[PDB]
Symmetry: C2
Subunit: 275 residues, 2 copies
């Protein structure tokens, strides 16, 4: 009980070390003036500082709680962010918040105290508001679906690996990155998938991981010879797509034992996207 709870909280602290490091640097490097030149109003820059403050609060609270439970808080890792202009700041922000929600939803499975679940659920709700904000600012629907779903710790590491240079402690190990082409679109979109590493693809299936219908398994098609996966009807919200071995894992959002490459995110088109 306590072992699993502290392990989940330290994992969450790793997630918030990464997000708070970004927002702190971004606010130090970009001004309200920079935001207005890029299409954003004063209140949008104000909210960006508010996001920074919220994420520093998430980090600090986790540190304090881990210490109060007798644990040893993970230190920050070393990070790198692919930032050029303000549009890239918004894209990085959206990417981080879109990964941190399934991080929280997965971690909450392992937290075995009612009071700690209430605190962590409360921060998840805050991160969901962040994600809606950055969606709206980048022309995406802020609320594209009814349910956000979980991913495992290693899955989150896979989403975050481009930003993490190294960690001084054994952080969750990522899977190879799965490139998706295109990375957004509506139901029926044929998505070409390529893996960053030469994994064995015998028996590899597409896992479409959706908040509202769970894991949907499909045999990959062909495009180059790249594997393809096709977005099925009925999914809503943000999707994660991964290669998995076999189909004995019924719920890949909570079970990475068969994961081979990915997941990566796919921004499903929704009512609310810019027109």
């Amino acid at each position: 009980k306590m072992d699993m709870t502290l392990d989940a909280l330290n994992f969450l602290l790793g997630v918030e070390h990464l997000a708070s490091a970004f927002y702190v640097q971004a606010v130090n490097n970009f001004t309200a003036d920079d935001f207005k030149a890029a299409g954003l109003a004063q209140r949008d820059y104000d909210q960006f500082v508010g996001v920074r403050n919220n994420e520093v609060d998430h980090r600090d609270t986790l540190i304090s709680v881990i210490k109060s439970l007798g644990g040893k808080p993970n230190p920050p890792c070393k990070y790198t962010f692919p930032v050029t202009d303000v549009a890239s700041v918004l894209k990085v922000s959206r990417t981080l918040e879109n990964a941190d929600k399934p991080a929280y939803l997965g971690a909450l499975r392992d937290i075995k105290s009612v009071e700690l679940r209430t605190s962590v659920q409360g921060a998840l709700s805050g991160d969901s508001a962040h994600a809606a904000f950055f969606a709206y600012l980048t022309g995406k629907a802020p609320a594209p679906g009814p349910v956000d779903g979980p991913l495992t710790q290693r899955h989150i590491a896979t989403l975050a690996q481009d930003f993490i240079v190294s960690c001084p402690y054994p952080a969750p190990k990522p899977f190879p990155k799965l490139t998706l082409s295109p990375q957004s679109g509506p139901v029926g979109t044929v998505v070409a998938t390529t893996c960053a590493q030469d994994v064995d693809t015998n028996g590899v299936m597409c896992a479409i991981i959706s908040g509202n219908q769970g894991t949907l398994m499909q045999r990959p098609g062909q495009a180059s010879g790249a594997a393809t996966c096709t977005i099925p009807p009925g999914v809503k919200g943000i999707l994660f797509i991964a290669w998995v071995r076999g189909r004995d894992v019924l719920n890949v959002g909570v079970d990475d034992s068969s994961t081979v490459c990915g997941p990566n995110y796919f921004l499903l088109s929704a009512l609310g996207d810019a027109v």
Copy 2:
């Protein structure tokens, strides 16, 4: 089995919440067009997302019905509703009010859901309603993400927040407390808020409860213009209630001393329209 009793009671409570929300958005989408939104200074994509909220809330309702039946419970039917809507400004204010109440509804209910798998599902729906609340905040000039932590309220607290939209229920729904009027109902730390209760309760022993997600409940003796002052250290959305006595330290999860309210208070935040 106690765990399963508590779980079913929480889910049927959330179904009452989602019957109300889905009834609102289904009617509102039927009564407003993109042209209405455009004339009021909004965009096509804002109307599109409004339709998406309706779809999302219909999904929340239908999911709770399916799960309650799968657990052998009997789903609560809809209550009967009325919504004070005549223009775009009112339809957005009602929307924001509903989503601001439905988040602490989910947060309180999750305390009583005793299955890991059902918590994951219900938490995911809470995440969705948090996105709704952010959207309606932004459209009404409020910060979409005003704080780090959203907090819970009890079932009866949520009934209190929703009572103006509920005409009657055909089953014993949570009973509201009298409404607590707040004036002003928004502002920064230090704002002095005049509080008036809809009924003539005994105010001997009554304290102001300031309920925050990041700090819990802050108790304070009411002032005289009854008033409550927004204290330092709070972040995000607040709820203010009258409580009797000082024995309840966490009002968000304990309504045994509540005597009027809560009502919401939109604490100022970075991201408000300037």
